[PDB]
Design a protein around this ligand. Sequence first.
Ligand SMILES: [Zn+2]
Ligand SMILES: [Zn+2]
Ligand SMILES: [Zn+2]
Ligand SMILES: [Zn+2]
Length: 274
Amino acid sequence: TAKKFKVVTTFTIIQDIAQNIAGDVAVVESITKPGAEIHDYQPTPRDIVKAQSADLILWNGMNLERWFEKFFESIKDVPSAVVTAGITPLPIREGPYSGIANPHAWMSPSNALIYIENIRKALVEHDPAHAETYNRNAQAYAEKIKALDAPLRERLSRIPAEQRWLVTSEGAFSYLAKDYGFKEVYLWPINAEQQGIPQQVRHVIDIIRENKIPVVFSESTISDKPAKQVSKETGAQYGGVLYVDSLSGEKGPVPTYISLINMTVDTIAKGFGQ
Ligand SMILES: [Zn+2]
Ligand SMILES: [Zn+2]
Ligand SMILES: [Zn+2]
Ligand SMILES: [Zn+2]
């Protein structure tokens, strides 16, 4: 074992999935730091350095990293791979990004199995000397992700189907909502310029009051103020912060992709009183 294969990912969810597949033979680092907003992130010369020293770059695609393609033009002779190939997208429903793919496909554990397969293929293609390790690690990690679905599904199934309204800030949960049968309500369809303007707040407030929805959420990379304003204006409790666009730090409460899915499902379930 000389120098380990170096993988750089755009953001932290992919970093942790890829690091599980890489195991001991590669080192995976994320360009964005935990807690940073990933859609409109502004890369720096230090990010260029990190990507250029990599052997493989991984990104989400599906319109997530608005910065990536321009950034990647600065990078020479480093292969890249988009990790969402083969996932059927859900379109964004409204706003200036309506009709394009919603990027947050990783919030469906079933989709995460496709993330794993695509990351496996890219590692095997660009570091074939370690193909057997990547293949073994990908199989073991996919087993964990597959087994994750049944307990999560059962817990959210405790919420009566007609009461399954997931009210969040960014509409980042469309894939989880599809999987587990939630109707989706959000303050803005995708992170961009307008996040919590009036008309956005008004629409959500009216939906909450009409259907007596009991809880509203924010997310870990954006402001909690619009959600808290909505809960103050309505009967709904502020259910806290869901994790979707970033892990916590390694020593924080959401250090891994598995911990992110578990934590988000648990916080939703608690907001509905289990
Ligand atoms: Zn493109
Ligand atoms: Zn095996
Ligand atoms: Zn008021
Ligand atoms: Zn997002």
